[PDB]
Amino acid sequence: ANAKRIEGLDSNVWVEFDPSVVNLGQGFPDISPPSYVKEELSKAAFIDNMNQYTRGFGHPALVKALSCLYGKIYQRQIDPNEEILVAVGAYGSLFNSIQGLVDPGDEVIIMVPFYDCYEPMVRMAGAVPVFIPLRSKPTDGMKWTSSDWTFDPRELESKFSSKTKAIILNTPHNPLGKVYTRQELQVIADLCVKHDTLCISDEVYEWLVYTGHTHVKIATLPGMWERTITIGSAGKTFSVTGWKLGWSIGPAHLIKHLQTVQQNSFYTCATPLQAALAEAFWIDIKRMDDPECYFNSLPKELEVKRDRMVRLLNSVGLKPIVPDGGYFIIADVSSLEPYDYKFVKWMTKHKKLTAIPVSAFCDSKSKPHFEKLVRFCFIKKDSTLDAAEEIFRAWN
Amino acid sequence: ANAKRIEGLDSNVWVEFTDPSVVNLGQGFPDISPPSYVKEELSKAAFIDNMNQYTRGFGHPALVKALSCLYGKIYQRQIDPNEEILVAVGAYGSLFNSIQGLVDPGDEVIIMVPFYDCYEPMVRMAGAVPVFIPLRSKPTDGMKWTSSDWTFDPRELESKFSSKTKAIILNTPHNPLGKVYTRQELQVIADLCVKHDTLCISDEVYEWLVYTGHTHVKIATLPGMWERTITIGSAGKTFSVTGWKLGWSIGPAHLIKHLQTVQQNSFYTCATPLQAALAEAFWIDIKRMDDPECYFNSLPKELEVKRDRMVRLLNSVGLKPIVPDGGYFIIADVSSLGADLSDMNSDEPYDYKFVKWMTKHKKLTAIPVSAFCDSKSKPHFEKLVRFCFIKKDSTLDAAEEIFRAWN
Ligand SMILES: Cc1ncc(COP(=O)(O)O)c(CN)c1O
Ligand SMILES: Cc1ncc(COP(=O)(O)O)c(CN)c1O
Ligand SMILES: [Ca+2]
Ligand SMILES: [Ca+2]
Ligand SMILES: [Ca+2]
Ligand SMILES: [Ca+2]
């Protein structure tokens, strides 16, 4: 018998989803992590102290590294102890944020399609998710891209009331690949300031922005530092999704409440992973300048792979939406229980290729508007994408 | 402002407890080496690319398979790795899953005092009402003071159960007392849980650390209890790697699913390389469970020696130790020292003053037992200080130097 708070929250999209099938579904990198990330974990393993309890809110060496890296991005001095919290992934950071800040009866605005945990997390806190969809614009004629999706500022305004506690922002966006523009962020900022709401900004894909786009942090916009929690992830930054380390960065008067959730929930994150992650950070922080920096080299490597996926999807009559950022690409499926779920089962069984139906990232009323869209992951090794080529070449 | 569910829960004893020349017998920080193979296995896992990516949400398959094998032997029943186990971020996370998945606002949860400090705020964050009952000492055998001289009154316990009781939290072996609950004590608890149809959440992280004359009994193995108990263990304790932060909840499928629902909506998955390495460590020791060199046997054997040394050290200065049946903490009554605390003028309990004094004057820290007590219980336990002995010989040598030079 569940507690009331988790009523109806037991179904989970990922819980629902053959070894000759090429999996382009889940965000499971099969490229290697950088060699030094692995080496540093090995080194921490052999130090006895690095196997025992560390500082609860974050390993001192790690919060110092994050302080120094993010202080450069933000152009401010970030207090490593008071303005940072290390949690169990971005998931954990998100949970800390909602649990510590959002009351039963609060409204939380979510942009659709949304990364799927946003909705049940808001609901577990007894809050009301208030949905607004991203919508299409006329294309430049040439190609379909993430930047051809935006939101209507007037519709957004109408979502804000005196019940609104916060808006959840995700840039670069999953599943669309949208890198939100400065002007878009400014509309969100104006409304958070005018209504005095929080912004929770999920920026795990922050390094993964392609040619002609720039990651901009809403927390750097005038008046936003004081009302924003910005979230990062080791799993994305260093392609080690299995390390489950993320962080929240923001003002002390907000971070302390995340800290209260953490000390009362899981308390401490793993010492060896955090020690190794601190060293991985120092290596790359010292060479941000250079194309060898993993912050530089990975987006560069992935852009090639993105462009590859777009050719392959085109090659078979699937209309790709070229992503500004991240490592997912959506394809419209229409020119070949919701449509995209049926299509994905059909493509698995008959083409030996798997993907994720976009309707999984949509509230019930929005699903008809997105149900002909399917998402593919390209943070894959050359050999994996060749196996995918084979499947596409052989499709007809 | 904070969310309402966390009002007044921002204070934390461990945060409150913050110098290189101080000998630290306070926090449960092991400075013995963990087993060599535990460290080896994490290194091995680090170099496998796959073991650095997402694994199964509710627990890495090899880990839960190892857990089901080991606990199947202990429970003498088949344990389902997927449906009857949930791997969480430490025993903390397991406790959190349990209370968050199973306990409603207005529910009562019975807690035994002193209690591992997190029990109280976890119950309050869920909007539930902690109902406290103290452990009470009884006359000693004359020669020694032990954990076994502490117990609860069964009639007092009974009176805490009402139609509003959702659960009782059991911690055995007990922190901070070191008490190993007897079959008869567990039987009293089981009787009431069955009579009122309540849950039992049983924190058994120290399950392997039981000393001569005592045996770890799992309440969930008693008649009627399997269907109503969540039993919690921890890698930090099992393998002396407190920094790995992996624990597990074991119980019936209809209860574990609720815990699994909290986890999927909170942090989701635990780290892959730690879980992979831990599985291997378990196999290495599962396969030699009958042998002295099994870590499950050698660690309590090694700790029993250290415990006895600590008892002697505390005695030499006039501290009155409570010899623990289990775990790696020891409590001493400090009141026969009548210490020079005259002018530390706060409204803090005696034991916190004593510890501050001991740290400054004697260069030795410990933990005040009142940190493990609710407001009304503090005066009944405030002359008691907790010392940790999961320590290497050289650390206890340093401690011994201080005790010898004490007067
Ligand atoms: C937008 C978004 N946020 C959060 C997460 C979870 O991050 P973590 O693995 O660090 O918990 C993911 C998973 N790839 C994601 O796509
Ligand atoms: C009784 C008890 N329960 C739970 C914990 C926390 O366990 P973990 O470190 O596995 O989260 C501790 C701390 N050692 C403890 O003493
Ligand atoms: Ca307002
Ligand atoms: Ca308050
Ligand atoms: Ca079975
Ligand atoms: Ca009842």
PDB file of C-alpha atoms in Angstrom, chain B residues 157-322:
ATOM      1  CA  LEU B 157       5.818  -0.473  24.239  1.00  0.00           C
ATOM      2  CA  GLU B 158       2.251  -1.801  23.891  1.00  0.00           C
ATOM      3  CA  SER B 159       0.807   1.539  25.087  1.00  0.00           C
ATOM      4  CA  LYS B 160       2.562   3.341  22.210  1.00  0.00           C
ATOM      5  CA  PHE B 161       0.623   1.276  19.653  1.00  0.00           C
ATOM      6  CA  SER B 162      -2.750   2.728  18.563  1.00  0.00           C
ATOM      7  CA  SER B 163      -5.033   2.633  15.498  1.00  0.00           C
ATOM      8  CA  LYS B 164      -2.792   5.499  14.217  1.00  0.00           C
ATOM      9  CA  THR B 165       0.501   3.491  14.221  1.00  0.00           C
ATOM     10  CA  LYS B 166       1.766   2.842  10.697  1.00  0.00           C
ATOM     11  CA  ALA B 167       5.195   1.563  11.602  1.00  0.00           C
ATOM     12  CA  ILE B 168       7.918   0.996  14.149  1.00  0.00           C
ATOM     13  CA  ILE B 169      11.596   1.564  13.336  1.00  0.00           C
ATOM     14  CA  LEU B 170      13.924  -1.108  14.748  1.00  0.00           C
ATOM     15  CA  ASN B 171      17.732  -0.693  14.731  1.00  0.00           C
ATOM     16  CA  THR B 172      19.721  -3.843  15.603  1.00  0.00           C
ATOM     17  CA  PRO B 173      22.587  -3.983  16.265  1.00  0.00           C
ATOM     18  CA  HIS B 174      21.793  -0.621  17.748  1.00  0.00           C
ATOM     19  CA  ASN B 175      23.555   2.702  17.218  1.00  0.00           C
ATOM     20  CA  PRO B 176      24.563   4.281  19.623  1.00  0.00           C
ATOM     21  CA  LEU B 177      24.176   1.605  22.367  1.00  0.00           C
ATOM     22  CA  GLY B 178      25.624  -1.413  20.583  1.00  0.00           C
ATOM     23  CA  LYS B 179      22.595  -3.440  21.732  1.00  0.00           C
ATOM     24  CA  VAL B 180      21.906  -6.696  19.891  1.00  0.00           C
ATOM     25  CA  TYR B 181      18.131  -7.257  20.273  1.00  0.00           C
ATOM     26  CA  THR B 182      17.224 -10.688  21.648  1.00  0.00           C
ATOM     27  CA  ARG B 183      14.721 -13.077  20.056  1.00  0.00           C
ATOM     28  CA  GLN B 184      12.359 -12.382  23.004  1.00  0.00           C
ATOM     29  CA  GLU B 185      12.547  -8.597  22.491  1.00  0.00           C
ATOM     30  CA  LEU B 186      11.891  -9.076  18.743  1.00  0.00           C
ATOM     31  CA  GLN B 187       8.987 -11.393  19.596  1.00  0.00           C
ATOM     32  CA  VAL B 188       7.337  -8.630  21.662  1.00  0.00           C
ATOM     33  CA  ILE B 189       7.782  -6.205  18.741  1.00  0.00           C
ATOM     34  CA  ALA B 190       6.457  -8.840  16.221  1.00  0.00           C
ATOM     35  CA  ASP B 191       3.362  -9.582  18.427  1.00  0.00           C
ATOM     36  CA  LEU B 192       2.349  -5.936  18.404  1.00  0.00           C
ATOM     37  CA  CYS B 193       3.034  -5.389  14.662  1.00  0.00           C
ATOM     38  CA  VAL B 194       0.820  -8.394  13.879  1.00  0.00           C
ATOM     39  CA  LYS B 195      -1.831  -7.425  16.539  1.00  0.00           C
ATOM     40  CA  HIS B 196      -2.107  -3.795  15.178  1.00  0.00           C
ATOM     41  CA  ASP B 197      -1.325  -4.659  11.538  1.00  0.00           C
ATOM     42  CA  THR B 198       1.656  -2.273  11.324  1.00  0.00           C
ATOM     43  CA  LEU B 199       4.916  -2.265   9.404  1.00  0.00           C
ATOM     44  CA  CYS B 200       8.407  -2.735  10.796  1.00  0.00           C
ATOM     45  CA  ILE B 201      11.355  -0.937   9.214  1.00  0.00           C
ATOM     46  CA  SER B 202      14.467  -2.730  10.457  1.00  0.00           C
ATOM     47  CA  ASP B 203      17.850  -0.963  10.110  1.00  0.00           C
ATOM     48  CA  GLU B 204      20.329  -3.851  10.186  1.00  0.00           C
ATOM     49  CA  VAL B 205      23.470  -2.196   8.713  1.00  0.00           C
ATOM     50  CA  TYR B 206      25.663  -3.570  11.536  1.00  0.00           C
ATOM     51  CA  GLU B 207      24.265  -7.155  11.138  1.00  0.00           C
ATOM     52  CA  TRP B 208      27.732  -8.755  10.782  1.00  0.00           C
ATOM     53  CA  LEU B 209      29.236  -6.901  13.734  1.00  0.00           C
ATOM     54  CA  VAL B 210      28.086  -9.046  16.600  1.00  0.00           C
ATOM     55  CA  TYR B 211      30.381 -10.244  19.360  1.00  0.00           C
ATOM     56  CA  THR B 212      30.827 -13.456  21.404  1.00  0.00           C
ATOM     57  CA  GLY B 213      27.764 -14.450  23.411  1.00  0.00           C
ATOM     58  CA  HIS B 214      25.344 -12.837  20.957  1.00  0.00           C
ATOM     59  CA  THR B 215      23.704 -13.579  17.638  1.00  0.00           C
ATOM     60  CA  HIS B 216      22.072 -11.346  15.020  1.00  0.00           C
ATOM     61  CA  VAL B 217      18.356 -12.311  14.680  1.00  0.00           C
ATOM     62  CA  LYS B 218      16.302 -10.825  11.790  1.00  0.00           C
ATOM     63  CA  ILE B 219      12.833  -9.865  12.925  1.00  0.00           C
ATOM     64  CA  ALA B 220      11.526 -10.406   9.340  1.00  0.00           C
ATOM     65  CA  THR B 221      12.206 -14.156   9.787  1.00  0.00           C
ATOM     66  CA  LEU B 222       9.787 -14.427  12.800  1.00  0.00           C
ATOM     67  CA  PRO B 223       6.155 -15.751  12.245  1.00  0.00           C
ATOM     68  CA  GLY B 224       3.867 -13.210  10.443  1.00  0.00           C
ATOM     69  CA  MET B 225       6.731 -10.694   9.937  1.00  0.00           C
ATOM     70  CA  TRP B 226       7.988 -11.300   6.356  1.00  0.00           C
ATOM     71  CA  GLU B 227       4.896  -9.693   4.855  1.00  0.00           C
ATOM     72  CA  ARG B 228       5.265  -6.584   7.042  1.00  0.00           C
ATOM     73  CA  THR B 229       8.971  -5.759   7.362  1.00  0.00           C
ATOM     74  CA  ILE B 230      11.548  -3.823   5.342  1.00  0.00           C
ATOM     75  CA  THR B 231      15.084  -4.842   6.316  1.00  0.00           C
ATOM     76  CA  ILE B 232      17.969  -2.609   5.446  1.00  0.00           C
ATOM     77  CA  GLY B 233      21.677  -3.272   4.935  1.00  0.00           C
ATOM     78  CA  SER B 234      24.673  -1.249   3.780  1.00  0.00           C
ATOM     79  CA  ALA B 235      27.906  -1.716   1.777  1.00  0.00           C
ATOM     80  CA  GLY B 236      29.642   0.927   3.933  1.00  0.00           C
ATOM     81  CA  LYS B 237      29.266  -1.412   6.890  1.00  0.00           C
ATOM     82  CA  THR B 238      29.556  -4.757   5.189  1.00  0.00           C
ATOM     83  CA  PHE B 239      32.821  -3.858   3.450  1.00  0.00           C
ATOM     84  CA  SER B 240      34.182  -0.932   5.444  1.00  0.00           C
ATOM     85  CA  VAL B 241      33.697   1.444   2.481  1.00  0.00           C
ATOM     86  CA  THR B 242      31.497   4.190   3.960  1.00  0.00           C
ATOM     87  CA  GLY B 243      32.263   6.350   0.895  1.00  0.00           C
ATOM     88  CA  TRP B 244      30.542   3.976  -1.561  1.00  0.00           C
ATOM     89  CA  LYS B 245      27.032   4.933  -0.318  1.00  0.00           C
ATOM     90  CA  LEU B 246      25.135   1.801  -1.336  1.00  0.00           C
ATOM     91  CA  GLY B 247      22.473   0.096   0.720  1.00  0.00           C
ATOM     92  CA  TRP B 248      19.528  -2.143   0.097  1.00  0.00           C
ATOM     93  CA  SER B 249      16.027  -2.771   1.281  1.00  0.00           C
ATOM     94  CA  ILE B 250      14.833  -6.386   1.395  1.00  0.00           C
ATOM     95  CA  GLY B 251      11.182  -7.380   1.935  1.00  0.00           C
ATOM     96  CA  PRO B 252       7.927  -8.523   0.279  1.00  0.00           C
ATOM     97  CA  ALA B 253       7.147  -7.503  -3.307  1.00  0.00           C
ATOM     98  CA  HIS B 254       3.984  -5.560  -2.359  1.00  0.00           C
ATOM     99  CA  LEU B 255       6.067  -3.247  -0.120  1.00  0.00           C
ATOM    100  CA  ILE B 256       9.333  -3.028  -2.102  1.00  0.00           C
ATOM    101  CA  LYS B 257       7.326  -1.774  -5.132  1.00  0.00           C
ATOM    102  CA  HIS B 258       6.361   1.334  -3.209  1.00  0.00           C
ATOM    103  CA  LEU B 259      10.030   1.920  -2.345  1.00  0.00           C
ATOM    104  CA  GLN B 260      10.872   1.390  -5.999  1.00  0.00           C
ATOM    105  CA  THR B 261       8.267   4.045  -6.930  1.00  0.00           C
ATOM    106  CA  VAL B 262       9.995   6.622  -4.686  1.00  0.00           C
ATOM    107  CA  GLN B 263      13.375   5.789  -6.133  1.00  0.00           C
ATOM    108  CA  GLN B 264      12.250   6.058  -9.796  1.00  0.00           C
ATOM    109  CA  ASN B 265      10.882   9.540  -9.001  1.00  0.00           C
ATOM    110  CA  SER B 266      13.893  10.729  -6.913  1.00  0.00           C
ATOM    111  CA  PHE B 267      17.491   9.828  -7.919  1.00  0.00           C
ATOM    112  CA  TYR B 268      16.548   6.798 -10.103  1.00  0.00           C
ATOM    113  CA  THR B 269      19.762   4.743 -10.397  1.00  0.00           C
ATOM    114  CA  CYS B 270      22.862   4.214  -8.297  1.00  0.00           C
ATOM    115  CA  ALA B 271      26.365   4.264  -9.679  1.00  0.00           C
ATOM    116  CA  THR B 272      27.343   1.406 -11.973  1.00  0.00           C
ATOM    117  CA  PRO B 273      31.094   0.959 -11.187  1.00  0.00           C
ATOM    118  CA  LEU B 274      30.462   0.790  -7.410  1.00  0.00           C
ATOM    119  CA  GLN B 275      27.605  -1.684  -7.877  1.00  0.00           C
ATOM    120  CA  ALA B 276      29.704  -3.853 -10.246  1.00  0.00           C
ATOM    121  CA  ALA B 277      32.677  -3.904  -7.888  1.00  0.00           C
ATOM    122  CA  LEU B 278      30.427  -4.587  -4.904  1.00  0.00           C
ATOM    123  CA  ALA B 279      28.803  -7.608  -6.611  1.00  0.00           C
ATOM    124  CA  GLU B 280      32.280  -9.146  -7.078  1.00  0.00           C
ATOM    125  CA  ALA B 281      33.284  -8.442  -3.465  1.00  0.00           C
ATOM    126  CA  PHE B 282      30.083 -10.192  -2.320  1.00  0.00           C
ATOM    127  CA  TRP B 283      30.804 -13.278  -4.503  1.00  0.00           C
ATOM    128  CA  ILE B 284      34.337 -13.498  -3.125  1.00  0.00           C
ATOM    129  CA  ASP B 285      32.997 -13.569   0.466  1.00  0.00           C
ATOM    130  CA  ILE B 286      29.747 -15.481  -0.200  1.00  0.00           C
ATOM    131  CA  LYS B 287      31.867 -18.402  -1.516  1.00  0.00           C
ATOM    132  CA  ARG B 288      33.804 -18.693   1.790  1.00  0.00           C
ATOM    133  CA  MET B 289      31.110 -17.976   4.376  1.00  0.00           C
ATOM    134  CA  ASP B 290      32.097 -20.945   6.574  1.00  0.00           C
ATOM    135  CA  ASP B 291      35.776 -19.902   6.703  1.00  0.00           C
ATOM    136  CA  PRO B 292      37.606 -17.618   9.243  1.00  0.00           C
ATOM    137  CA  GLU B 293      38.960 -15.557   6.342  1.00  0.00           C
ATOM    138  CA  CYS B 294      35.507 -14.509   5.105  1.00  0.00           C
ATOM    139  CA  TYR B 295      35.263 -10.775   5.724  1.00  0.00           C
ATOM    140  CA  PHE B 296      31.869 -11.359   7.432  1.00  0.00           C
ATOM    141  CA  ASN B 297      33.786 -13.381  10.075  1.00  0.00           C
ATOM    142  CA  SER B 298      37.182 -11.698  10.195  1.00  0.00           C
ATOM    143  CA  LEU B 299      35.920  -8.114  10.701  1.00  0.00           C
ATOM    144  CA  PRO B 300      33.856  -8.709  13.877  1.00  0.00           C
ATOM    145  CA  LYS B 301      36.762 -10.933  15.151  1.00  0.00           C
ATOM    146  CA  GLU B 302      39.202  -8.027  14.601  1.00  0.00           C
ATOM    147  CA  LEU B 303      36.760  -5.500  16.108  1.00  0.00           C
ATOM    148  CA  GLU B 304      36.067  -7.516  19.268  1.00  0.00           C
ATOM    149  CA  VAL B 305      39.758  -7.141  20.215  1.00  0.00           C
ATOM    150  CA  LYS B 306      39.565  -3.378  19.601  1.00  0.00           C
ATOM    151  CA  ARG B 307      36.347  -3.097  21.569  1.00  0.00           C
ATOM    152  CA  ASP B 308      37.975  -4.739  24.602  1.00  0.00           C
ATOM    153  CA  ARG B 309      40.997  -2.405  24.364  1.00  0.00           C
ATOM    154  CA  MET B 310      38.631   0.592  24.335  1.00  0.00           C
ATOM    155  CA  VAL B 311      36.719  -0.683  27.378  1.00  0.00           C
ATOM    156  CA  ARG B 312      40.104  -0.855  29.220  1.00  0.00           C
ATOM    157  CA  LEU B 313      41.170   2.593  28.053  1.00  0.00           C
ATOM    158  CA  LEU B 314      37.880   4.240  29.174  1.00  0.00           C
ATOM    159  CA  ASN B 315      38.053   2.490  32.547  1.00  0.00           C
ATOM    160  CA  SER B 316      41.598   3.783  33.240  1.00  0.00           C
ATOM    161  CA  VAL B 317      40.344   7.413  33.317  1.00  0.00           C
ATOM    162  CA  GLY B 318      37.142   6.598  35.301  1.00  0.00           C
ATOM    163  CA  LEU B 319      34.747   6.672  32.319  1.00  0.00           C
ATOM    164  CA  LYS B 320      32.112   3.954  32.845  1.00  0.00           C
ATOM    165  CA  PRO B 321      31.895   2.068  29.479  1.00  0.00           C
ATOM    166  CA  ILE B 322      28.830   0.183  28.278  1.00  0.00           C
TER     167      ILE B 322
END
